[PDB]
Design a binder for these strands. Structure first.
Ligand SMILES: [K+]
Ligand SMILES: [Mg+2]
Ligand SMILES: [Mg+2]
Ligand SMILES: [Mg+2]
Ligand SMILES: [Mg+2]
Ligand SMILES: [Mg+2]
Ligand SMILES: [Mg+2]
Ligand SMILES: [Mg+2]
Ligand SMILES: [Mg+2]
Ligand SMILES: [Mg+2]
Ligand SMILES: [Mg+2]
Ligand SMILES: [Mg+2]
Ligand SMILES: [Mg+2]
Ligand SMILES: [Mg+2]
Ligand SMILES: [Mg+2]
Ligand SMILES: [Mg+2]
Ligand SMILES: [Mg+2]
Ligand SMILES: [Mg+2]
Ligand SMILES: [Mg+2]
Ligand SMILES: [Mg+2]
Ligand SMILES: [Mg+2]
Ligand SMILES: [Mg+2]
Ligand SMILES: [Mg+2]
Ligand code: NA
Ligand code: NA
Lengths: 53, 52, 52, 75, 116, 89, 122
RNA sequence: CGGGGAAACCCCGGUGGAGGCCUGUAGCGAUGCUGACGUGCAAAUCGCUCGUACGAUUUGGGUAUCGGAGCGAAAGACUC
RNA sequence: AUUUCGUGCCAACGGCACUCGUACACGAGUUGUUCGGUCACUGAGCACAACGUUACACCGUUUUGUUAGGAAAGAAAAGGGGCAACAGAGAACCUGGGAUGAUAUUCCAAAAAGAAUUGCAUGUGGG
RNA sequence: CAACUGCAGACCGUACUCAUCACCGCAUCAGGUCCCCAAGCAUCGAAUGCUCUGGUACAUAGAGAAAGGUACACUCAGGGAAGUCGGCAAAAUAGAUGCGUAAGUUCGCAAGAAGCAUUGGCUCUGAGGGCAAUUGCCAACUCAGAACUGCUUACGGCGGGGAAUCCAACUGUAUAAUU
RNA sequence: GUGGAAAUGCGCUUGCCAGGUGACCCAUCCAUCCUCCCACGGUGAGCUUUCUUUUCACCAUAAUCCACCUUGGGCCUCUCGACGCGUUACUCGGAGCGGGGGCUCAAGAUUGAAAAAUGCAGCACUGUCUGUGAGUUCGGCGCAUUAAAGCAAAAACCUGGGGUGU
């Protein structure tokens, strides 16, 4: 039930990054998936390592 | 669905600043641009509306 | 062909009109047929003018 | 895309502070300066090879300038 | 050899869905939608449906964004009537008013003459 | 009468519908498609457009007339009666 | 089109010609002259093979000296003032290669304007 | 457009493209073989042949009228 | 309504066969300011409110400019609130890609491969 | 108020199919099911026959001249409806061009009435146009004619006709599954 | 606000009223885009017992924008016509034909920015075209023909009449 604007603000609060685009889809099993592109000043690989991926 | 042609006549509203459009059954010889007079003091001509 | 001759002034407006209606009337079979008729008409006009 | 006509118009556009970069294209018998501003790409086409260098050296050092070349898939 | 497919999501050939065939720089043949055309400004229908001069035929979005003088002329009743119809109204206004002034004077003078 | 001896415009019907019904409809068909004199502009330019509606190609006037002819004989009598009764006052 | 054709004129065709003239086509055989695949005798008949097979105005074997075949420095140069297609000499070269049974050993490509050369492949 | 005629008017040749017009595809139907099948491919289908094919024509979606009732160019037709 | 894709698998099933499979098992896949719909139009029509009827609303009226014996407007304006078209009206985006196993006018990042068009608020210069 | 510039542009759909296997017919059933794109040659051609691109070799197979069958397969001397309730079924006519065409009639038709002739291949000739300055260059296949030469009458596709009687004027509709 | 004798050209805001777009889908004819043949040329493959300057494939340019010769229609002005102009075709003209010069609308063409920096084929580099004919409902003739058959509506948007402001 979340929308794009709420997702973008939640990401910054949780991980302290700035984004440039959010794309969403609803999966066939009912879940919602989001692709989030970070700004060039932020490294997605560095953030994923901090997350624990 | 109707055999008789109809006429669109345009009057002025008696009390307001607007125009009133009416739709009547046309008598023979009626033409576009003709003047229609309706009332007690109207003359006796084809297409005019008078009290009996 | 008739339009070209009128522009070049080898023919005048009187003959052009007469030949225009005869072309529509199925008188001339092809381009050569029209050209021989025009010369025949023009030669007769020369004879009448020289008689005047 | 818009075309610049004379030099004095080009100097004003290149000094608009909105130019991200200036792309220089070296075509045969012509050189083109393509200024990338917001909403529009302004081009200036010069048929004289000389003083086309003069503009290249006299461009503002602050703005970024690139030479357009043919890039490959791996490039 | 090449055959084409609809690229948007309406697959019926109506008057509002008309396509032209275009060859791309990649050597492909695709369908591109061509829009509807307006008929442009006209004179009033009861006065004859005549296309006005000096006005362009623009669709709803283009007409809103266009400059004003593209839809009008700089004369009274600019983008509404034609020059023949403007002349008719001016002559009608002046001549009919003249008859009222003349006939009013005649009625007044005849009454005064009769009373004396 | 080069193409047809007597059928005229009804030659489009072939050998159907009978000779007398075709003759009765031919008279009204000819006048309905004819060109009638316009009193407003003095031209033979009145043509029918739907039953009882006549439009002039010259002056672009529209008149309410009768079915298959611009003016009916009953209308001519009525105009004279009304004119006399108006003049009677 | 304008003139209806006849069977009697089928044999011969007009060759047409260039206004400026002096157009030269070159075929280079430096690559196989580098190795032993070719031979001087093969080069000699190559000169003759082109000399008698190139047609002129629809007929073959009779040259009016408007087409010159002489070759020097392992390069066969055709100089003519008559209109020709560059592909024609590639077609003639393929015919010669097949007759000598060398189609699977030599391939012919083009560099620029009016130049062909023979190379190996692997 | 040419002829004929005192007139009323009458003839030839072109042009034009009408019609619940004709032959004939797609479409919409279903005459004959009383063909095939008749525990079928099919609780009505298959093959040739056949009717019509600019009109009272064919068709998608939406909408409106039903069981002592609805609807019917009328066969006690049709209403899962 | 997962039949799509990859890997595996041959018990049952595909009226014969299978090492194949729309079968079985385990994991994956559907990305939009501009595409379709809603936002935001009327049509054949429907029937909330109001009124009337009925022992009983689970009934009738409700577009021929239009509800209701009818005080339904939150500076003049008469006539309540809605729905019904993914083929009618309306509608600001195009190519290239070495960008996939499966998605793309939806993905591409500073030389955005790029070139545009349009809706809001702001700020400067003309003012 | 017109330019420019900075920022932001919400929600849902998006895989696959659309059928001789993905839908409805108990099923992977020769039945049914709306829309768009549509190449070359023959030819009047969306008829019919063959082919490049794209797509398919999937529908149980092997061996193999019994009778009797089914067929979107044929041929038969002499006769030619003698068969049968009944010419049912089959045969038969056939394209195009030139000539020619009856009774009857509501004057439109009947009419492709009926009937006769020609048709291949090869080599030529004539007619039918445009643009530039009488000349030059150039394009489209249609029609007509001639000489020579040949036939085993030789793909496909394509009306049998006439003289009368009864009924209904005509086009149309109509018992889904015996009229 | 302003230019031109005119058609009409160029550069503040709308209580009320009035028009327009939306908006009505055509046989025939002409026709863009597009694909299908030819002629010339470049590149690469195919056949070669014998012939074949030959057979086959490819030769591409999206939206958006700038500047401004063909066709069809409407109109102004000068000179003012009885016979004249015009279509394949059923027309037209003192209620203003035709001719000279112009204003304007629609559909196209041409120069340029985008854009060669892309794409394609052959092997780091090479090549990277135009002109004819036939077909085909965008558009045009505000189109013929049956008609006792003869314009679906509305939102949204555009312009003007008045008024206000300078
Ligand atoms: K008969
Ligand atoms: Mg989405
Ligand atoms: Mg028929
Ligand atoms: Mg049976
Ligand atoms: Mg009974
Ligand atoms: Mg099995
Ligand atoms: Mg729509
Ligand atoms: Mg949309
Ligand atoms: Mg399909
Ligand atoms: Mg099936
Ligand atoms: Mg042929
Ligand atoms: Mg065919
Ligand atoms: Mg077929
Ligand atoms: Mg026998
Ligand atoms: Mg017997
Ligand atoms: Mg039979
Ligand atoms: Mg007779
Ligand atoms: Mg015959
Ligand atoms: Mg009957
Ligand atoms: Mg039955
Ligand atoms: Mg006179
Ligand atoms: Mg006179
Ligand atoms: Mg003039
Ligand atoms: Na309604
Ligand atoms: Na019929």
């Amino acid at each position: 039930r979340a929308n794009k604007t709420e997702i973008k603000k939640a990401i910054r609060k949780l991980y302290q990054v700035k984004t440039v685009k959010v794309n969403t889809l609803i999966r066939p099993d009912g879940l919602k998936k989001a692709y989030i592109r970070l700004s060039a000043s932020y490294d997605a690989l560095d953030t994923a390592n901090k997350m624990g991926l | 669905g109707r055999g008789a042609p109809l006429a669109r006549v345009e009057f002025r509203h008696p009390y307001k600043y607007r125009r009133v459009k009416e739709l009547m059954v046309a008598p023979e010889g009626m033409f576009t641009g003709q003047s229609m007079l309706c009332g007690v003091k109207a003359p006796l001509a084809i297409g005019n509306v008078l009290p009996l | 062909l008739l339009r070209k001759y009128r522009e070049e002034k080898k023919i005048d407006r009187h003959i052009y009109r007469e030949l225009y209606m005869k072309a529509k009337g199925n008188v001339f079979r092809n381009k050569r047929n029209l050209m021989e008729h025009i010369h025949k008409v023009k030669n007769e006009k020369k004879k009448a003018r020289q008689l005047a | 895309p818009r075309e610049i006509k004379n030099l004095k118009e080009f100097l004003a556009i290149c000094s608009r502070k909105d130019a991200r970069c200036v792309k220089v294209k070296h075509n045969p018998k012509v050189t083109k300066f393509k200024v990338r501003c917001s909403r529009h790409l302004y081009t200036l086409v010069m048929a004289d090879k000389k003083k086309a260098d003069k503009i290249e050296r006299s461009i503002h050092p602050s703005v970024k300038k690139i030479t357009v070349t043919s890039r490959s898939h791996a490039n | 050899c090449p055959r084409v497919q609809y690229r948007r999501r309406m697959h019926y050939a109506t008057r509002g869905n008309r396509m032209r065939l275009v060859r791309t720089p990649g050597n492909r043949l695709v369908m591109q939608k061509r829009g509807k055309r307006s008929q442009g400004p006209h004179t009033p229908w009861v006065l004859g449906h005549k296309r006005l001069a000096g006005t362009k035929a623009l669709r709803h979005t283009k007409a809103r964004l266009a400059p004003r003088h593209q839809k009008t002329t700089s004369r009274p009743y600019g983008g509404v009537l034609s020059h023949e119809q403007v002349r008719d109204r001016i002559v009608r206004a002046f001549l009919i008013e003249e008859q009222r002034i003349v006939k009013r004077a005649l009625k007044a003078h005849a009454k005064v003459q009769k009373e004396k | 009468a080069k193409r047809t001896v007597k059928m005229g415009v009804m030659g489009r019907y072939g050998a159907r519908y009978g000779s007398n019904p075709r003759k009765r409809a031919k008279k009204l068909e000819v006048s309905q498609h004819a060109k009638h004199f316009c009193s407003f502009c003095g031209k033979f330019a009145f043509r029918r457009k739907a039953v009882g509606i006549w439009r002039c190609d010259g002056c672009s006037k529209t008149v309410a007339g009768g079915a298959y002819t611009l003016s009916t004989p009953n209308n001519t009598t009525v105009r004279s009666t009304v004119r006399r009764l108006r003049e009677l006052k | 089109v304008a003139v209806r054709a006849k069977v009697g004129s089928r044999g011969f065709t007009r060759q047409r010609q260039l206004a400026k003239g002096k157009k030269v086509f070159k075929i280079d055989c430096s690559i196989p002259a580098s190795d032993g695949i070719f031979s001087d005798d093969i080069l000699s008949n190559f000169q003759q093979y082109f000399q008698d097979n190139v047609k002129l105005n629809g007929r073959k074997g009779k040259l009016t000296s408007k087409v010159r075949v002489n070759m020097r420095e392992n390069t066969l140069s055709i100089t003519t003032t008559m209109a020709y297609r560059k592909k024609y000499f590639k077609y003639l070269t393929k015919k010669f290669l097949k007759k000598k049974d060398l189609r699977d050993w030599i391939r012919i490509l083009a560099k620029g304007k009016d130049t062909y050369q023979l190379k190996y492949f692997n």
